[model samples]
Target: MSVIKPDMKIKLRMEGAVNGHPFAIEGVGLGKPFEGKQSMDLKVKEGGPLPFAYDILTMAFNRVFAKYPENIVDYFKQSFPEGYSWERSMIYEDGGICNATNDITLDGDCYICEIRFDGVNFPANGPVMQKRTVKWELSTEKLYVRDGVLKSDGNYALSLEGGGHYRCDFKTTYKAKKVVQLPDYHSVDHHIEIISHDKDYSNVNLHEHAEAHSE
Candidate 1:
């Protein structure tokens, strides 16, 4: 478990495409309260450890490509394939987030940079001892800055990289709370809020803005 610090107050929302397919996700993770970069796993709705509609084999398509449409696992019957074995969890490293500073402005002026399963290693062959790696880079063309925090709203797209299992093009928006309950830790679905639909937030006199409920 990636130490869910008690101060996990940032909720990041993302909408984008994977392998040319569209998808949406949200998650809560550690961040510098007021500014800087953050990273988290992503999910869709309440039902995924994987973002988008990609099946398990699809996420691992590169590792298992040789066996395509045939054995999803290794046919050689090895004890465990390099990336095929279900040992320590690889689920959490599926996605990432960050903000890059601009070249000629204040430190806070930056753009969004995200990656999906970049730099993670897998088996070169289903049963071979060899290894391979993947990378997916998603970044925004415009720079943005919030009032003070690192959270911002923007879009990003990944080029046709030959790794990372899949390519992505997505938009992101975020909000911060002193605390939230049951948010999608993997960033796979929308962060859940328990407040009643009839509740009024105006009286709270908060600084947070609204953005059509980042579905």
Candidate 2:
């Protein structure tokens, strides 16, 4: 049995209007609107929070099915009718630090699945506008870690477990908003929009530029 490798990269880009406008208005009557791309690389380990992989896989599967659920279901049934199973072998230390586990599953083997949802609201002249997006990813890699090294050879089979489960590593970049406030100065909130993915199966890195201004 081969180990599922966690060296693959996942790239994502989201562009849309917020609050019915493309930009934010500043306290100095300055309008600061912006848009950009976010990229990420996912590393699947043998054991640990598998949320990143779950988020990616779910997003891709759901996106394809959203347009052709029947076709996709039929295809999967014909290919692997028994259905696949997975589980939450592990989680990132920060997985639910600010969000909730939206989904999780096991595909009869070593494959595990999961999802999380995050939303934010920005105050507008009239009412606050809200924006939300769901994140998903998955891995077919078996998890294992040893001597400070995390490994997943890309094989999703529990019987072939080849390494130390406690040492497995998983990494992901979360979409977050950074807020800077002062007692006398106006408060500023910057949407830290970007895709963060694991690198070298060790660290999670961000890929978007940040924007902020006094409110």
Tell me the tens digit of each residue's lDDT in model 2 across 10-75: 222222122222211111001111221223433433323322222212221111011112111211
Per-residue C-alpha lDDT of model 1 across residues 90-109, encoded as one tens digit per residue: 22223422211111111122
Every model's TM-score = 0.23, 0.18
In model 2, which range of ten residues has the least summed lDDT? 23-32
Q: Runs in model 1 with CA error above 4 Å? A: 1-8, 12-24, 33-35, 46-215
